[PDB]
């Protein structure tokens, strides 16, 4: 009987622990995209294949 009470309690707690992990994963995914947008902010001005045809032609 104690084990039934224990398994019932552990899954209630387990749900909350899994939810907490999920919340931190979600924050990483969101933070990661903000960083990627900031990366594009500074990399963008040079993302070209440049100054080749200028002499070839």
């Amino acid at each position: 009987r104690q084990l039934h009470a224990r398994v019932d309690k552990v899954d209630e707690e387990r749900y909350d622990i899994e939810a907490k992990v999920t919340k931190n994963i979600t924050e990483i995914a969101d933070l990661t995209q903000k960083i990627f947008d900031l990366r594009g902010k500074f990399k963008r001005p040079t993302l070209r294949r440049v100054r080749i045809s200028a002499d070839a032609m």
Binding site: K34, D37, L38, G40, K41, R44
Partner: protein, 375 residues
């Protein structure tokens, strides 16, 4: 991050929110009670840019934002914006999770009931705080000031509450509450400066005037003599630098605005002023109470940092008070920062552990529990 489940303390007013944890000396961070929103169409793409900004973000990016305060005259009218302010307060700058800490919030004793009820609901439902308490501003000021008896005259941004307390008990029949506050003084200063050729009608302009007020304005000890000189000579003008390089000087307007606290008629208000209401809070208490309240006029809240205000408040009430008796004002460098300080003290008292509402009782009663458990 703490070694105890210390309560979080958040002094949420109509001005700035001061927040930190119980047991400390000072808030960890302060935030304008503001949620900002762009009033312009975006032109460049991939610029980030939020739909809404919170606290200091809203103020820092204010050049193109309209800024709204969720709290007016001490009451939350917009709780969605307060959820954002608290999210920011707790997770971005204090970097704590209320889920693991009790939270203490503050209000005036006659603040309409919806304020404490919605504050209780937000913390129990969006932050899932284990416990709550909504505290009295006067109580918090009295703990911070070292008193159990006195008049707490709290003239801040929202309302002036002015409640007499004796031996730690309310004397509610003598609360000389007044709908006159620091926000009205700011509005008056925007208008009086407009008259000098410096119009202040937009959000950016309003934030600038509040900054001007805080650094340049005063009430003085004698208005008529102060104006006789200020209105006659440039020697009493003081300059201020605006963000775009403009320079504004203010003459008698520098004190005529703030003077509205003593002369409310300047903004169309029907009132005796804060010093007469302070006097009446003492006078309306029993005769064996009056002597202790006269000796303990407790100054707190905003506007308490105007030059001449502590000296003037004692002068104005001692002038109405009877002779022989000594009338005194208490106005420590902890003025206005007394409500937050009191929150830290109160949250931490062992006797206050019987006052906190838990996230147990809350579920059975709902947020209305605040009216059964706090005060």
């Amino acid at each position: 991050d703490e070694d105890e489940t210390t309560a979080l303390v958040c002094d949420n007013g109509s001005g700035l929110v001061k927040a930190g944890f119980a047991g400390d000396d000072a808030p960890r961070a302060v935030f304008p009670s503001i949620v900002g929103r762009p009033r312009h169409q975006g032109v460049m793409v991939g610029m980030g840019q939020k739909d809404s900004y919170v606290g200091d973000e809203a103020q820092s990016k204010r050049g193109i934002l309209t800024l709204k305060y969720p709290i007016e005259h001490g009451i939350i009218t917009n709780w969605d914006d307060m959820e954002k302010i608290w999210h920011h307060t707790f997770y971005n700058e204090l970097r704590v999770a209320p889920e693991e800490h009790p939270t203490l919030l503050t209000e005036a004793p006659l603040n309409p009931k919806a304020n404490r009820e919605k504050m209780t609901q937000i913390m129990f439902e969006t932050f899932n705080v284990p416990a709550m308490y909504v505290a009295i501003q006067a109580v918090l000021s009295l703990y911070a000031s070292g008193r159990t008896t006195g008049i707490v005259l709290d003239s801040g941004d929202g309302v002036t509450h002015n409640v007499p307390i004796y031996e730690g008990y309310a004397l509610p029949h003598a609360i000389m509450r007044l709908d006159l506050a620091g926000r009205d003084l700011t509005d008056y200063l925007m208008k009086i400066l407009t008259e000098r050729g410096y119009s202040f009608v937009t959000t950016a302009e309003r934030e600038i005037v509040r900054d001007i007020k805080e650094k340049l304005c005063y009430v003085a000890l004698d208005f008529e003599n102060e104006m006789a000189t200020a209105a006659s000579s440039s020697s009493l003008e003081k300059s201020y630098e605006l963000p775009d390089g403009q320079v504004i000087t203010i003459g008698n307007e520098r004190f005529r605005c703030p003077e509205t606290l003593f002369q409310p008629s300047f903004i169309g208000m029907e009132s005796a002023g804060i010093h007469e209401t302070t006097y009446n809070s003492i006078m309306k208490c029993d005769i064996d109470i009056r002597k202790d309240l006269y000796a303990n006029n407790v100054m707190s809240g905003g506007t308490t940092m105007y030059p001449g205000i502590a000296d003037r408040m004692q002068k104005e009430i001692t002038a109405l008070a009877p002779s022989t008796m000594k009338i005194k004002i208490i106005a420590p460098p902890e003025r206005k920062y007394s409500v937050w300080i009191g929150g830290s003290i109160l949250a931490s008292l062992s006797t206050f552990q019987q006052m906190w509402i838990t996230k147990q009782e809350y579920d059975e009663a709902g947020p209305s529990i605040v009216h059964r458990k706090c005060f």
